[PDB]
Amino acid sequence: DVRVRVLPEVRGRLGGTVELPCHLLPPTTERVSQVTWQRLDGTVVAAFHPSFGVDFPNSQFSKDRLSFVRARPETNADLRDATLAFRGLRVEDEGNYTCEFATDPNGTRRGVTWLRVIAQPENHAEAQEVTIGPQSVAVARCVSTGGRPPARITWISSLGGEAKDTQEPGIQAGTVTIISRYSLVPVGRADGVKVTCRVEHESFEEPILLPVTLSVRY
Ligand SMILES: *[C@@H]1O[C@H](CO[C@@H]2O[C@@H](C)[C@@H](O)[C@@H](O)[C@@H]2O)[C@@H](O[C@@H]2O[C@H](CO)[C@@H](O)[C@H](O)[C@H]2NC(C)=O)[C@H](O)[C@H]1NC(C)=O
């Protein structure tokens, strides 16, 4: 809608807090019958009712966790801002939230914010010592654990290796782990060659560079 003002997407650290803005642009004279926030699955999260007052009907999104960012509404105008604050974000607070204003007698208007919960992963790379030999094996590995969304691992290498990585879910629901094994058939002129594991993830401004010096044996 035009009459309702929201952010198309919002981002908050897992366990952290977010504000979902919402306002009724056209500063008209028409009363706000009520305001309500619904997830797209149809779960009403928070609402200000006509004469009843402010409400938070679902168990999972209790009053202890959600609240309207502007809580002392004098007169209708005071209603034009339905900005909602989440504290203690869980993965399940993820969603497409619809901010809807009911106006009298018809009809209602509404905006949609995508609420995304982000989890910063833990990353590390180590070298695997290997003996020279005809089969390719993993000479180096990098692990990006507990990231949301999944991190992206690439490698910077002067050797002619294939990085083949695999994904498992992390210990935390919502989060995923990437294990990247860099393989090339261990030659000898690998030894001491600095190779970088590069992890990209939303929670970092720039890719993370993890240096590794390769070993080879005998
Ligand atoms: C949250 O919504 C965004 C935006 O998408 C709109 O409404 C959705 C319900 C759906 O109908 C989309 O087609 C609409 O664009 C979603 O972002 C899209 O995600 C889809 C997978 O459903 C993906 O293929 C598209 O590339 C995304 N669209 C755009 C324009 O980037 C997102 O998936 C929704 N998230 C959740 C958890 O529901």
**Can you list the domains of the chain with their CATH numbers?**
1-120 (2.60.40.10), 121-218 (2.60.40.10)
**Residue 114 beta carbon below 6 angstroms from any ligand 1 atom:** yes
Cα(148)–Cα(167) distance, integer angstroms: 12
Who's near 131: CB < 8 A, 6+ residues apart? 186, 216, 217, 218
Cα(182)–Cα(141) distance, integer angstroms: 6
**Residue 10 beta carbon below 6 angstroms from any ligand 1 atom:** no
**Residue 96 beta carbon below 6 angstroms from any ligand 1 atom:** yes
- Of 11, 38, 114, the residue with max ligand 1 atoms within 8 A of its CB, to mutate for a pocket test, comes to 114
Resolution of the experimentally solved model in angstroms: 3.2
The SS3 of residue 76 is helix
Half-sphere exposure of 94 (CA within 13 A, CB side): 14
CA of 114 to the centre of ligand 1 (A): 9
